[PDB]
C-alpha positions as CSV (number, residue, x, y, z in Angstrom):
1,N,-55.9,25.1,-31.6
2,T,-59.8,25.2,-32.1
3,L,-60.6,21.0,-31.2
4,R,-58.1,20.1,-28.8
5,G,-59.1,16.5,-27.2
6,L,-60.6,13.9,-28.6
7,D,-62.5,11.3,-27.1
8,V,-64.9,7.8,-27.7
9,S,-66.1,5.7,-25.1
10,R,-68.0,2.4,-26.6
11,T,-70.8,1.4,-24.5
12,G,-73.7,-1.3,-25.2
13,S,-76.5,1.8,-24.0
14,G,-75.1,4.1,-25.9
15,A,-71.9,5.0,-27.5
16,Q,-70.1,8.5,-26.5
17,V,-68.2,11.0,-29.2
18,V,-67.1,13.4,-27.2
19,V,-65.3,16.6,-29.0
20,T,-63.3,18.9,-26.9
21,G,-62.5,22.9,-27.7
22,T,-61.0,26.1,-26.5
23,R,-64.6,27.5,-28.2
24,P,-68.1,26.7,-28.2
25,P,-68.5,25.3,-32.1
26,T,-71.2,25.4,-34.7
27,F,-72.3,22.3,-35.1
28,T,-74.8,20.6,-37.6
29,V,-75.4,17.0,-37.5
30,F,-77.3,14.6,-40.1
31,R,-77.8,10.6,-41.5
32,L,-76.7,8.9,-44.9
33,S,-77.6,5.8,-45.3
34,G,-76.0,2.6,-47.9
35,P,-74.7,2.2,-45.6
36,E,-76.1,4.0,-42.3
37,R,-73.9,6.6,-41.4
38,L,-73.7,9.7,-38.8
39,V,-71.9,12.7,-40.4
40,V,-71.2,15.7,-37.5
41,D,-69.7,19.4,-39.5
42,L,-67.5,21.6,-37.2
43,S,-67.3,25.1,-37.5
44,S,-64.6,27.6,-36.6
45,A,-62.5,24.7,-35.8
46,D,-62.0,21.1,-37.9
47,A,-62.8,18.2,-34.8
48,T,-60.8,14.8,-36.2
49,G,-61.0,11.7,-34.3
50,I,-59.3,8.9,-35.9
51,K,-57.6,5.4,-34.5
52,G,-59.6,6.1,-31.0
53,H,-62.6,3.4,-32.8
54,H,-62.4,0.1,-31.0
55,E,-63.3,-2.7,-33.1
56,G,-65.9,-3.7,-30.8
57,S,-68.2,-0.6,-30.5
58,G,-71.1,-1.2,-30.5
59,P,-72.5,1.8,-32.6
60,V,-69.5,2.7,-34.8
61,S,-67.7,1.0,-37.5
62,G,-65.8,3.7,-38.2
63,V,-64.6,7.1,-38.4
64,V,-63.7,9.1,-41.0
65,A,-62.6,13.6,-40.8
66,S,-61.8,15.6,-43.7
67,Q,-61.6,19.6,-43.4
68,F,-62.4,22.0,-46.2
69,S,-61.5,25.5,-46.2
70,D,-64.0,28.8,-47.0
71,Q,-61.4,31.9,-47.1
72,R,-59.4,31.8,-44.3
73,A,-62.4,29.6,-42.2
74,S,-62.6,25.7,-41.9
75,V,-65.0,23.3,-41.8
76,G,-64.3,20.2,-40.5
77,R,-66.6,16.6,-41.1
78,V,-67.0,13.9,-39.3
79,L,-68.1,10.5,-40.8
80,L,-69.7,7.5,-38.6
81,A,-69.8,4.6,-40.6
82,L,-72.7,2.9,-37.9
83,D,-73.0,-0.9,-37.0
84,K,-76.9,-0.1,-35.8
85,A,-79.5,2.2,-36.2
86,S,-79.0,5.3,-33.9
87,Q,-81.1,8.0,-32.7
88,Y,-78.2,10.3,-32.1
89,D,-78.2,13.3,-28.9
90,V,-76.3,16.8,-29.0
91,R,-75.7,18.8,-26.4
92,A,-72.8,21.2,-25.5
93,D,-71.4,22.0,-22.5
94,G,-68.9,24.6,-21.9
95,N,-66.0,23.8,-24.6
96,R,-67.0,20.4,-25.2
97,V,-69.7,18.6,-27.7
98,V,-71.2,15.6,-26.6
99,I,-72.7,13.2,-29.2
100,S,-74.7,10.2,-28.0
101,V,-75.8,7.7,-30.3
102,D,-78.2,5.8,-28.7
103,G,-80.1,2.4,-30.6
104,T,-84.2,3.1,-30.6
105,S,-84.6,3.4,-27.0
106,Q,-85.3,6.8,-26.3
107,S,-86.1,7.1,-23.0
108,V,-86.8,5.2,-19.8
């Protein structure tokens, strides 16, 4: 597999989404509106997270995942419907890709 685990840490200051994988992931993150959404596209690996979204995540209303094929390769799209406006921050560390969804406060 490429993606081996997927974790969501809902908290009031920021919700963290973690995607763990066997190789460093190429990704792109972007926004959509009507409804407010955050979208992550993952290459080589298609990471799908589901049923991990708690009914009390202050940020994530829900998460849908789908993979599409490009030749023998696969692109996975993760879609997070939101409860409030976010400023996402994404960083990689080893085989983990971290996305933290902050509200409107970016630095203390």
